[PDB]
């Protein structure tokens, strides 16, 4: 959604120079049926040696995030056993976001297959230290635990 501040930001980016600008926007929703009065911060820098120019849009409440510190090797297990598709009465009905949890996992549209394969690839995860990232897997396991 075009503002007059965003036209300024575009003309600033095209000139290949760095900057930053926080202001109040009109953020059309993802379903294209609502509009919110957002609060964004456009930080941008030029991509060196190229004609492009990169920018990162970031809300004010998005300057911090949760880094899951689960390194006991057993806490991740004690959160992971709770996601299996047999315990769907003590916990609710869960879906797993099809992300790049790691290269052996192949995302599908049949979400229950992804939940399954995710469970098996959780089962033997300790040997996959240089294989797939602790960040996303720990964050998702911790979120499953809190939920």
């Amino acid at each position: 959604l075009e503002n007059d501040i965003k036209v300024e930001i575009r003309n600033k980016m095209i000139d290949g120079e760095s900057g930053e600008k926080t202001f109040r926007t009109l953020v059309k929703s993802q379903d294209e049926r609502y509009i919110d009065k957002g609060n964004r911060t456009y930080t941008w820098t030029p991509v060196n040696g190229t004609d492009y120019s990169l920018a990162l849009v970031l809300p004010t409440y998005s300057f911090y995030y949760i880094k899951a510190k689960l390194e006991e090797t057993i806490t991740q297990a004690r959160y992971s056993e709770t996601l299996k598709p047999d315990n769907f009465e003590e916990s609710g009905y869960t879906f797993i976001a099809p992300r790049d949890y790691c290269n052996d996992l192949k995302i599908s549209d049949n979400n229950t297959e992804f939940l399954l394969n995710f469970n098996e690839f959780i089962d033997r995860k300790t040997p996959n230290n240089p294989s797939c990232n602790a960040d996303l897997i720990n964050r998702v396991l911790l979120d499953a635990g809190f939920t």
Binding site: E20, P46, V47, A55, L56
Partner: protein, 147 residues
């Protein structure tokens, strides 16, 4: 600011990787064509090449007088999502251009050093997609041989 600079320099590094691949390919193409001697007799000196518009059936009579065609072995790569064979580069010749004329056959001759450099480019950067020489005689010679 840190995230924007980090992602911008990563994108710069990717684009400069592909730029160096282009530099290598163009260096070899110019050097090889500069050391090429014209011909008009390709009945004895075959030009062996894969024509991308070919039939997968093992039919020997699909070839042309001046050139002997390759029958490749196509493996499945999910990086490209199609049939790929990394042993040689396919050739595309427009339907309006004869694949046996002298210009086309000379272009098909001096462009196999391109096969070697394509392979050596992909070895150094395993993530590379199509790399192609778009010839001014109508040919395109893209490396991962696919129909």
């Amino acid at each position: 600011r840190q995230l924007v600079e980090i992602a911008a320099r990563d994108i710069e590094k990717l684009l400069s990787n592909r730029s160096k691949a282009l530099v290598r390919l163009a260096l070899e193409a110019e050097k090889v064509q500069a050391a090429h001697q014209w011909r008009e007799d390709f009945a004895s000196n075959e030009v062996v090449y894969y024509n991308a518009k070919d039939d997968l059936d093992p039919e020997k009579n699909d070839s042309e007088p001046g050139s002997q065609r390759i029958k490749p072995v196509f493996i499945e790569d999910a990086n490209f999502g199609r049939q790929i064979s990394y042993q040689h580069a396919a050739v595309h010749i427009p339907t309006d251009i004869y694949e046996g004329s002298t210009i086309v056959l000379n272009e098909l001759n001096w462009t196999s050093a391109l096969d070697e450099v394509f392979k050596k480019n992909r070895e150094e950067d395993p993530s590379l997609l199509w790399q192609v020489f778009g010839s001014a005689t109508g040919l395109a010679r893209y490396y991962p041989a696919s129909p």
